[PDB]
Design a protein around this ligand. Structure first.
Ligand SMILES: CC(C)c1ccc(/C=C/C(=O)NC(=O)N[C@@H]2O[C@H](CO)[C@@H](O)[C@H](O)[C@H]2O)cc1
Ligand SMILES: O=c1[nH]cnc2c1ncn2[C@@H]1O[C@@H](COP(=O)(O)O)[C@@H](O)[C@H]1O
Ligand SMILES: *Cc1c(COP(=O)(O)O)cnc(C)c1O
Length: 809
């Protein structure tokens, strides 16, 4: 149908058809007369998977032969979403399969919707890991993602009476055609026990054993025949475990619970033993795999052949685990082991909020991992001896930099452990990396300035343009060719089309088509009516106070109140869509969801408003829903309090798909505005510097309430029961937080936000100038390819060169 989707050659179409019919018969054990759409989805998935295996076998064989440096990306989350279309895109099979399925009387788009998301992450951190795997394969790096195969990923969100309900994401119920179990490569992991000090070093004994069984998933690079591996570990009881007879068998569940469910609490660190077991499980199994591979080729050259990237502090136990293996098992001297460890490990930080940092109670480590605790203490003593030698007499610095935190309960600060144990520490956007050096890790930067780096985040333009917005990808390809898909900086060529009347028309037409399709998706799946000519104003991300979905809510109420005040006055019509999951125990996030639906309930049924304003809560926001909504958006809401959002990546998704951004100077928004020009961005609100000045003086929300009548009306409406008639005190906790203990200064940015939103509406009334600004954003989005991000990691941290060269097919 369209060029960027590849050729539908007659041999290929014929061959896909027969393999499809073969899988339906032999693999699925069905015939056409009783096959369902799910069976057809699986027959297609197996058909496409067959095309990966040759390239997968020879990629891994290639790495065995050439023995390049291996990159191991350790993460507790890999938010992959669906695999079928992404695989087709990367192998150039999309049009072929579309034709093949069309000739069999089937609609491939309908079959794609049957696939469950692999929802093995919470949001940005998890999705970054997935974009990274795609880029590493695309750039020909010998890279392996290592994680946990959760039986239950991030919960499915249901809204009942406007409240979030959580239900289990049983994503493996119908099977996973992409993974290959490798029970033959199963490895033991130890827990509990005690440490014995013999003549010839320490021994960790009397341990309980859990087996780690790997499952391998192929990661195809974009049209280069490279297929890398994501290996995810599953927990299995040993066969002598607990060995009433019946109860001993039933108690195998206790060991296997390690890989049962992803922790969804992305706001607040809670030290739960089961999460600690998860974090050790992934690290212990992964490092045995790493060492095995290294030996099949003297630990002096270990850092020349291995790099380990720690995604946040979650796999930080890699540091003392590598030290344990090298010292206790391989018998290296401490100093040599430490040199090897530091040169192998690198750490990426994702938040400056102190309640998010992992600080594990010493008593849990003492019980669960007694040897690792001893090693952490030894690391700490040798580290603090260095601090003392560089800053003699600075006793407060010693307590500030310690890996061991004193108090009610002693804790280990895992971020301090990562910095001590890594040759490189990076933030994920320039302003965040600067904040790490100036504030939370200032002492460490002064000790070892060379460790600190910036690697601004990015997104893959395969999933986030070519896959989710083929219409846009095609109209771009028409003018500049297809090479921009693996070299996104080429989008700068589109600056020479900003005054091209045909291109302006095509960009606008693609957005209108995406909006019509999404408006049809909404009505069909959820029975809700929207105006497709309205401005689509969208904020989708996890629900957090720092992200300030509440500030958006206040703007929505302002618009409604303005309409009720002057109903016969023209306003630019809007559909305001907000979506995102709240962590199950985060009461305020749950209250915010209830407030959004409560606003919707009033606004959507007011006959005087009409179709000029609608407020939709987008239920169960996840990767597959992002792929639908982001191409339909006009305005991207990126409105966190300055200094709180480390980077953001949804922001980049919107930029690439033709939405304009309203945002604070926070995270990667700063760099996005720098690339596009501040004139082509709707910047508002306090800068980081302004936030600091307000903190020194003291934030008094009452001041803003006293001075801004429109804000006072909104707060009185919240308090009096305007948005909750039958429960008039429902939102008291929200009002109380806003007035007395708002860490994120919602009222301080309100006036500027509302003004800025008026400038958005003004520009939207001139479709031609709106579209021209859109083109200037799309054309300067190149820097935010995760290919650029990974090439920087490779050159500046891992010490490897990327390659765009094909492997032979
Ligand atoms: C130990 C247990 C309690 C636990 C701790 C943390 C998490 C999840 C964190 C997460 O989901 N973090 C996250 O998504 N960060 C975002 O990382 C993105 C990629 O760098 C950034 O763009 C965002 O700014 C950052 O908030 C889950 C469980
Ligand atoms: O002893 C060997 N002989 C031949 N090929 C090997 C041997 N060991 C590893 N390989 C190759 O490398 C492996 C890749 O799997 P991995 O070692 O689990 O990453 C196999 O798939 C082989 O292609
Ligand atoms: C990109 C993405 C995120 C990250 O969004 P932010 O706006 O950067 O927080 C979260 N969830 C999903 C499903 C995503 O695709």
């Amino acid at each position: 149908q369209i060029s960027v989707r590849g050729l539908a050659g007659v041999e290929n179409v014929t061959e896909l058809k027969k393999n499809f019919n073969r899988h339906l018969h032999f693999t699925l054990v069905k015939d056409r007369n009783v096959a369902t759409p799910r069976d057809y989805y699986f027959a297609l998935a197996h058909t496409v998977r067959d095309h990966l295996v040759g390239r997968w076998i020879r990629t891994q064989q290639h790495y065995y032969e050439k023995d390049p440096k291996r990159i191991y990306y350790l993460s507790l989350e890999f938010y992959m979403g669906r695999t079928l279309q992404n695989t087709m895109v990367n192998l150039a099979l999309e049009n072929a399969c579309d034709e093949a399925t069309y000739q069999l009387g089937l609609d491939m788009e309908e079959l794609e919707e049957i696939e469950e998301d692999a929802g093995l992450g919470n949001g940005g951190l998890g999705r970054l890991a997935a974009c990274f795997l795609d880029s590493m394969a695309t750039l020909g790096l010998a890279a392996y993602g290592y994680g946990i195969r959760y039986e239950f990923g991030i919960f499915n969100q249901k809204i009942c009476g406007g409240w979030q309900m959580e239900e289990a994401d049983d994503w493996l119920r119908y099977g996973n055609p992409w993974e290959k179990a490798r029970p033959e490569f199963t490895l033991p992991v130890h827990f509990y026990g005690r440490v014995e000090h013999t003549s010839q070093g320490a021994k960790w004994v009397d341990t309980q054993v859990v087996l780690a069984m790997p499952y391998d998933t192929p990661v195809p690079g974009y049209r280069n025949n490279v297929v890398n591996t994501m290996r995810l570990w599953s927990a299995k009881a040993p066969n002598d475990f607990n060995l009433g007879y019946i109860q001993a068998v039933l108690d195998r569940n206790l060991a296997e619970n390690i890989s049962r469910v992803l922790y969804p609490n992305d706001n607040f660190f809670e030290g739960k033993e089961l999460r600690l077991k998860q974090e050790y499980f992934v690290v212990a199994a992964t490092l045995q795999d790493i060492i095995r591979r290294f030996k099949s080729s003297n630990f002096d050259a270990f850092p020349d052949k291995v790099a380990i990237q720690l995604n946040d502090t979650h796999p930080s136990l890699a540091i003392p685990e590598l030290m344990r293996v090298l010292v206790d098992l391989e018998r290296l001297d401490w100093d040599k082991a430490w040199e090897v460890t530091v040169k192998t490990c690198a750490y990426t930080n994702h938040t400056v909020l102190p309640e998010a940092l992992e600080r594990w109670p010493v008593h849990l480590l003492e019980t669960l991992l007694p040897r690792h605790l001893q090693i952490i203490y030894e690391i700490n003593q040798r580290f603090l001896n260095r601090v003392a030698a560089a800053f003699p007499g600075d006793v407060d610095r010693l307590r500030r930099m310690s890996l061991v935190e004193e108090g009610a309960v002693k804790r280990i600060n895992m971020a301090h452990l990562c910095i001590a144990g890594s040759h490189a520490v990076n933030g994920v956007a320039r302003i965040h990396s600067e904040i790490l050096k100036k504030t939370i890790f200032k002492d460490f930067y002064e000790l070892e300035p060379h460790k600190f780096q910036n690697k601004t985040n990015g997104i893959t333009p395969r999933r986030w343009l070519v896959l989710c917005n083929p219409g846009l990808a095609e109209i771009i390809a028409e003018r500049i060719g297809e090479e921009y898909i693996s070299d996104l900086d080429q989008l700068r060529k589109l600056l020479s089309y900003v005054d091209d009347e045909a291109f302006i028309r095509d960009v606008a037409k693609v957005k209108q088509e995406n909006k019509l399709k999404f408006a049809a998706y909404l009505e069909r799946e959820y029975k809700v009516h929207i105006n497709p000519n309205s401005l689509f104003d969208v904020q989708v991300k996890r629900i957090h106070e720092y992200k300030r979905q509440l500030l958006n809510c206040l703007h929505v109420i302002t618009l409604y109140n303005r309409i009720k005040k002057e109903p016969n006055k023209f306003v630019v019509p809007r559909t305001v869509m907000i979506g995102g999951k709240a962590a199950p125990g985060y009461h305020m996030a749950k209250m915010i969801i209830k407030l959004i639906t409560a606003i919707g309930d009033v606004v959507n049924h007011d006959p005087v408003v009409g179709d000029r304003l609608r407020v939709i809560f987008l239920e169960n926001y996840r990767v597959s829903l992002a792929e639908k909504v982001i191409p339909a958006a006009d305005l991207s809401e990126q409105i966190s309090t300055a200094g709180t959002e480390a980077s953001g990546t949804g922001n980049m998704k919107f930029m690439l798909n033709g939405a304009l951004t309203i945002g604070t100077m926070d995270g990667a928004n700063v760099e996005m505005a720098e690339e596009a020009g501040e004139e082509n961005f709707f910047i508002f609100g306090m800068r980081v510097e302004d936030v600091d000045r307000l903190d020194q003086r003291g934030y008094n929300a009452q001041e803003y309430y006293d001075r801004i009548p429109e804000l006072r009306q909104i707060i009185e409406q919240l308090s009096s029961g305007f948005f909750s008639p039958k429960q008039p005190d429902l939102f008291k906790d929200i009002v109380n937080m806003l007035m007395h203990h708002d860490r994120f200064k919602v009222f301080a940015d309100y006036e500027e936000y509302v003004k800025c939103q008026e400038r958005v509406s003004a520009l939207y009334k001139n479709p031609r100038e709106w579209t021209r600004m859109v083109i200037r954003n799309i054309a300067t989005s190149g820097k935010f390819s995760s290919d650029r991000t990974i090439a920087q990691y490779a050159r500046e941290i891992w010490g490897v060169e990327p390659s765009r060269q094909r492997l032979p097919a």
